Symmetry: C4
């Protein structure tokens, strides 16, 4: 029952919300687990939300200090898609402060990276059993995708980075079978820096849209042949810039070099679906802050430096906080002849942005899937009144 | 294993309570989810309560403002029948502020309507996967039944309305197979306005008892042939008026026109079971407010304008709040040769009626099923002391 | 897979605790459901605690007034044996203020009695579906066992009473098949009053030890032939009195008449296992109040008026509150050649006895099973500090 | 499907964290169950945490006094590995204040010891049904392993002790089949006192590393032949002392006699894996207090009195509290040709050590598994700020 990526992407004319956990609203009174960098992964039995918990709930004195990325009290949880995460409905999968997870059609592989900054180790599980460990190779925050990996013919591909966040680093493309590394390649191609890849599968290939945290406000792209287990890397061709922060959009993009100019923030995790005319990119509305979120239809954004926005859908209006965004697909919808693009938006609340109200940072989640036909409109922000928490 | 509606309704001589979640009483301390417009739907594995949550619990500061019908923080939950809804026992099914759900014998179809008032879209799921989307066709609060739909031979019928709440609107009768629209008809017949249909199946047909929010205090009725997938509409014939608000009962009803005179409130969701002599209608006891609830036996209420009440059972006494009511049936009770009529009553607490005590509105649920033999008596109100919440 | 009562009782030399939910201790902070009159019932998949909830938790303002026996907010819950009951782990089975439940080997039958005092109806379920209703026949608190019923060859026997609590009443022995009454007998024999029977099965028979709430401090006994579906009734023969309240033990008991003299309280639910020399009776230690609990070995207590106590085990010491007690047996322990006697003790806290500390009454549960070999000793009281709740 | 111990231990070059429940951090607000002496046990369907609860949660007034070891309100719970224990996710398995549990490949056997200090009885369950009881034989706190037992060919071995904690006592090696004792041996060999054995299986044998609470700061060891069901006992040979408290390490250890000198505390539960060069022992970092935890690689520690530490991994740094530690193995990882050593560390918080902050004592849990390859580093302490609880 190994997943074979034998399908193309569905045409997407618009997006609808399939899940929204409202975690922060509920978190005002219920024991909602403090989380960040969430994502969604499906498998033959359904879909679940995944997130990095902070070993505390919101209305808990330990919520103080949760802006920090890496502690010994972090781990990966999965909770039913659409539900806010509480202890009672959450599966504690592994311990660590960076993660990825995916199902190969028979078993789920999940990875957590734990330990000190200079001496970290990735813990790899298959079917919920420890299978292998991978030591830091650069000695500086070994880290991975923060969204679902993708599998094909029993092999799952994972993108990991080790080394400096703000200059040249050491990224590897890893191929796993049953939670064991069977092949590794150092990053090839023109992408100068790779972080937090959002990946999806199609026709025996995997496309990853990533984060250049070094120089680029245009997103790097990794292309993987899953049968040959080889890859190459590049940048998106559009001058429509979709990282944050970023300068104004250019008339002409650069397929092979990072476009610089970014005001301050070096990056945010994002995604895109590259399918010629059926090409959609995600983007914070603010070019400076993680506020708002919009889906842009940009035909051939992956190949044409003169590509332009043709359609736009607002997901979160610019008066509200967003954050990470990543791709996922139900690869086991056997009643559809195509893979339907889906994505999630992390809705970050608290610090640093709301430091005057609150000592914690957490997030809620909204998840969207594509429709081949025109849809209506609507904004889906976090919805909590932060003052309630002061 | 497709459900075939090959049975008639059981004779009902009286009603007994099968479930009562006591949500508001529990909500005084436990993290009960704030809800409204609930219902019940069965399937081969059992029955569950369905409701529209408000993205908060009662003892949560976000409970303030929950009188509002449509927000981005609303969604559909299912919880085990009889239990009050908390995060731990609730399945978050879709996002939206109007819904319906039913099982076809093999898979469950559920529908949520989400988005802005003028630009709404229905999201349709089959077996918990997004299958189709339906855009607003009138551009004014696309909306549906707020109780279970009904299926036959793999086809499920749904009633939806789009347009003005207080004048002529655009109602469609939709036929689904595996979450895909296979046929649509504009409303036919003499019913002038259709809202919030309560439907049940019998002998390859579906009967819907609805809400005329425009002119009528007598309830419109939709009759559907499930094999031909055609329908017609009408009003109940009785002069015993069962909407709220309503004027006094008339000696002679009108099978083909709305009976006007209503004091204030234009309508409330209700139901009826039309089976000749075995005909029962539901009704708030107050003709002005959503207080009390009574079951009335009115032989041939669906066909005879001179029909009269012959039996009455009080369900909720007039010193207590009620609200919506709708029909449901366990269509998979294979040990019975007949379909037993069941119904639920929404017990609304808080605003607007209890505005001086509280800033929220939510509801509890009581569910009843029929008995072919005389039963005893009893009132089953919400049971919370609203002052405890001040 | 119908249960056939083809086994005898195991020899019991002593008792050990298999479950203790500590509900009141936990109830100091956790949302423990307020309950009373609990019991235990097994089936092929395991054992669960059953209880009558009060539609509230302890640390909830609605806990005020829970001394009252019959409200519209009462129902039957089942929770995993050994766990304290919370909403998250409890199955809300039916609505009512008196109940019984048992598994026939294929399906579980459960019964709740609901409604007004003079107009009550029993609701009967089989495999969690409403099957039949039974109207009050005497018009005064139709009521039943408050512990598990027993089944044989597809037929389950239930004892119900309707009428006066303090004088002659109308008790029926009912035989059910798949939640349908197939036979009823009026009480026969010398027992003058029957309440709250504790029943167990053995060798195609059912023995019930009950409560004479009228005259007798000695317990009435009902003997049922399950193949013939006929019964007879009697009193325990011992002069060792095991109801509460009761006068001092007599040298000579009465097999056929109630022994009077009771100080105040007319009765409490209790049990016994009648197996010649292997005969054990339960008993509050105080002859006046529901405090303490002790198991007494009284050979031939069921047949010999000169029977004497030979062994004694203290379960709850006399400095602590007890309450109801009843019998249960795992009839699906296929690895044992005998049915092992088990019983539960209801540990009542709050009113009326602790009225000066608290406005609620609830209970915790301790459950014991027999051992064919000598065991050690120990007291297992509720364990809550009632002052914590003031 | 009986487990056959047909495998050897995997080589371990280092340890990674697979689970950390963060119970005390969560316990600041969520209803976390108060526990101590936890452990981990696997079976064909996965792994779960086991612990002795105290019949209360942390933020509960009944948490006051939980330093006491033995009450009637103690029992054994199992909760999903990695999750903190709450009522909603915990299985209440038996009642008592000492326990062990293991799966034989077909059914789980679990044991609780309950009752008074001089008159205790072990309750034994197989497949969650009471199977046998074992009365105290020395009349002084009958007690057992506080970690998982081990099974082979349908037989599970358990180590129990009865008698004085601070002098000669009466230890038995018990062999169970389906929860029935089939063989018992009095302790043989040179070990003078045996408490709280940590056991693991390998090649049809079981090795237990225990606690000499009488004289020895070096750990006693029990060797069991599982086919012959015979055992012998000894001490670890190393002069590297791994009990607490303990004097400084000696150059030469004693294979056959306890090494004395211990400052104060007579012992703590610990473990070791004895596999020649692949030999690892656990140890509190402080030789006086239960603070810190370190894994030491000591080749042939079980056979060579001149054995030395060669590798060391810090698990919990010496600024943090630890406690018990024990061994466990997933014996049903069929994709590995070897049994991978795993262990847990109990992280005790509260009294006696933090008596000035708090009136309770509880623990959190961290669980580690081996890796055949070098890993990174990191400390994994409890992580709660005890001042938050004052
Ligand atoms: C959340 O955690 C932060 C950090 O612990 C808390 O802020 C800190 O509060 C302490 C007082 O409890 C401040 O300590 C002070 O430090 C100065 C030196 O900077 C010293 O001279 C004083 O005697 C005092 O000890 C500390 O400065 C302050 N830190 C910051 C960054 O403001 C905060 O109060 C916590 N929030 C809640 C709601 O508890
Ligand atoms: C539940 O929500 C309502 C609405 O937010 C709260 O009522 C509102 O309370 C605010 C004060 O916090 C009032 O604001 C005032 O508005 C007037 C103008 O109308 C302005 O001149 C004042 O300076 C002040 O800002 C607001 O009027 C009031 N709204 C209503 C409709 O009464 C309510 O307090 C909330 N309940 C709880 C328990 O928090
Ligand atoms: C639990 O519920 C009981 C019953 O409602 C509460 O006791 C009652 O408290 C009210 C005051 O809130 C008393 O009302 C008084 O009644 C007298 C006539 O008897 C009237 O003249 C006074 O003006 C006043 O309204 C009532 O007597 C009293 N009932 C009893 C039996 O004492 C009790 O306070 C509740 N407990 C908690 C903790 O809220
Ligand atoms: C946790 O439990 C302990 C033990 O019950 C509490 O400490 C105790 O507090 C009581 C007062 O409530 C003290 O009682 C006093 O005893 C002396 C004789 O020793 C007597 O002369 C006084 O009249 C008074 O009754 C008791 O000494 C004290 N025990 C200890 C060991 O300090 C403690 O307060 C509880 N913690 C919390 C937060 O409630
Ligand atoms: C899917 O994976 C299998 C296993 O790796 C591939 O089949 C193997 O192909 C190699 C040669 O390329 C043979 O030596 C092995 O014996 C094959 N294994 C089996 C089990 O048949 C297969 O080629 C892969 N599919 C694709 C499309 O590449
Ligand atoms: C139940 O549904 C099936 C499928 O729609 C109906 O069977 C189809 O009937 C049409 C003609 O009306 C044929 O062309 C199809 O080939 C049939 N499909 C199958 C799978 O047999 C069937 O008629 C419906 N039942 C009723 C009573 O109307
Ligand atoms: C167990 O129950 C079955 C069903 O009631 C009994 O079998 C029936 O016996 C009657 C005569 O007594 C026959 O007329 C029926 O045809 C039988 N039914 C079946 C399905 O065989 C059976 O006798 C009962 N067992 C005992 C020991 O009394
Ligand atoms: C595993 O256990 C079984 C059962 O105890 C052992 O098989 C038994 O061996 C005895 C003689 O030693 C025979 O008398 C029994 O008839 C056997 N029972 C069965 C079911 O075959 C078996 O020897 C054990 N395995 C090992 C390796 O010792
Ligand atoms: C360490 C570099 C990495 C990518 C730039 O930083 C990320 C920045 C993130 C951010 O920009 O919000 C927060 C992430 N938690 C962090 N990842 C880790 C493992 O700490
Ligand atoms: C928008 C018209 C519609 C039917 C009249 O209003 C209903 C009135 C209801 C009512 O009268 O209580 C509340 C319902 N939540 C609402 N439905 C929606 C989708 O908002
Ligand atoms: C109504 C008579 C009946 C038996 C004497 O009273 C019982 C007394 C019980 C008791 O003595 O504690 C409380 C029970 N809840 C009650 N049963 C019902 C249905 O109310
Ligand atoms: C009774 C002797 C026994 C072993 C020394 O004491 C243990 C000491 C333990 C300890 O040193 O922390 C606490 C354990 N809870 C206790 N075991 C029991 C059953 O009480
Ligand atoms: C409805 O939403 C779509 C975006 O999906 C937008 O193009 C369209 O203009 C909207 N219609 C109205 C009336 O706002
Ligand atoms: C019992 O209830 C029925 C209604 O179901 C009613 O007709 C009857 O009069 C009631 N009996 C009494 C005595 O109240
Ligand atoms: C142990 O308990 C039994 C009761 O089960 C009792 O007979 C015996 O005397 C007790 N032993 C001691 C030493 O208390
Ligand atoms: C990483 O951890 C190992 C222990 O597992 C240790 O031997 C090594 O020195 C560490 N490396 C660094 C750079 O700290
Ligand atoms: Ca960037
Ligand atoms: Ca109307
Ligand atoms: Ca009596
Ligand atoms: Ca020692």
């Amino acid at each position: 029952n190994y997943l074979m990526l034998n399908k193309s992407l569905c045409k997407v004319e618009g997006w609808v919300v399939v899940a929204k956990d409202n975690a922060i609203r509920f978190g005002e009174s219920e024991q909602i687990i403090v989380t960040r960098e969430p994502y969604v992964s499906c498998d033959p039995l359904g879909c679940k939300m995944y997130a990095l918990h902070q070993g505390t709930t919101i209305r808990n004195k330990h919520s103080n200090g949760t802006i920090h990325d890496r502690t010994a009290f972090r781990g990966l949880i999965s909770t039913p898609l659409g539900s806010p995460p509480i202890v009672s409905n959450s599966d504690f999968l592994c311990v660590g402060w960076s993660s990825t997870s995916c199902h190969d059609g028979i078993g789920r592989m999940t990875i957590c990276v734990q330990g000190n900054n200079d001496n970290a180790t990735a813990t790899v599980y298959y079917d919920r059993r420890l299978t292998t460990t991978i030591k830091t190779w650069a000695g500086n925050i070994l880290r991975t995708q923060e969204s679902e990996c993708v599998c094909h013919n029993g092999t799952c591909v994972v993108i990991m980075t080790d080394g400096s966040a703000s200059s040249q680093a050491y990224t590897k493309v890893l191929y796993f079978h049953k939670g064991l590394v069977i092949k590794e390649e150092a990053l090839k191609g023109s992408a100068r820096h790779i972080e937090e890849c959002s990946c999806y599968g199609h026709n025996s290939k995997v496309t990853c849209v990533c984060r250049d945290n070094w120089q680029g406000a245009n997103r790097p792209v990794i292309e993987i042949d899953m049968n040959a287990m080889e890859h190459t890397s590049q940048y998106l061709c559009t001058g429509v810039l979709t990282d944050t922060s970023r300068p104004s959009d250019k008339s002409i993009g650069d397929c092979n070099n990072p476009i610089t100019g970014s005001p301050g923030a070096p990056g945010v995790k994002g995604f895109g679906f590259l399918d010629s005319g059926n090409t959609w990119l995600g983007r914070t509305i603010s070019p400076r802050s993680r506020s708002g979120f919009e889906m842009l239809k940009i035909p051939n954004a992956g190949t044409d430096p003169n590509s332009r926005i043709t359609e736009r859908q607002e997901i979160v209006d610019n008066n509200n906080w967003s954050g990470y965004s990543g791709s996922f697909i139900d690869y086991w919808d056997e009643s559809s002849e195509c893979y339907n693009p889906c994505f999630y938006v992390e809705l970050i609340r608290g610090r640093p942005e709301e430091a005057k109200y609150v000592w914690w940072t957490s997030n809620s989640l909204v998840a969207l899937c594509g429709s081949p036909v025109p849809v209506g409109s609507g904004s889906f922000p976090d919805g909590a009144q932060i003052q309630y928490f002061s």
